């Protein structure tokens, strides 16, 4: 089922061609905070969750389609 192992060459059948695998590193083996003052950042303003233009609201569970 989903629990079953997935072979390396058949897995390639599960993803679009845009992406390249990473090699696993060697160091990977399989198996309060107080008061602080903040620095100004612009980056959270920069990221958008919606497409730009006259496009409708993009629901969060549609992201991988659009």
């Amino acid at each position: 089922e989903r629990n079953r192992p997935l072979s390396d060459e058949e897995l390639d059948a599960m993803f679009p061609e845009g992406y390249k695998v990473l090699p696993p590193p060697a160091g990977y083996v399989p198996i309060m905070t107080g008061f602080h003052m903040q620095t100004e950042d612009r980056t959270m303003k920069s990221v958008n969750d919606q497409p730009s233009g006259n496009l409708p609201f993009l629901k969060p569970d549609d992201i991988q389609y659009f």
Partner: protein, 51 residues
């Protein structure tokens, strides 16, 4: 003032980390030491039992 207060808070905070860290590490040695000692006493009723 903001700049000054950040510096002060960070430096003051940093000192506490070092203090806590040393206490942490000192206490860790005491645990392993205590562990070996009990192993030593094992090498050489105030209990709860159940049916």
């Amino acid at each position: 003032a903001d700049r000054k207060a950040r510096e002060a808070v960070e430096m003051r905070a940093q000192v506490e980390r070092k203090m806590a860290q040393k206490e942490k590490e000192k206490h860790e040695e005491k645990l392993r030491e205590m562990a070996q000692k009990a192993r030593e006493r094992r090498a050489g009723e105030n209990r709860d039992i159940s049916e």
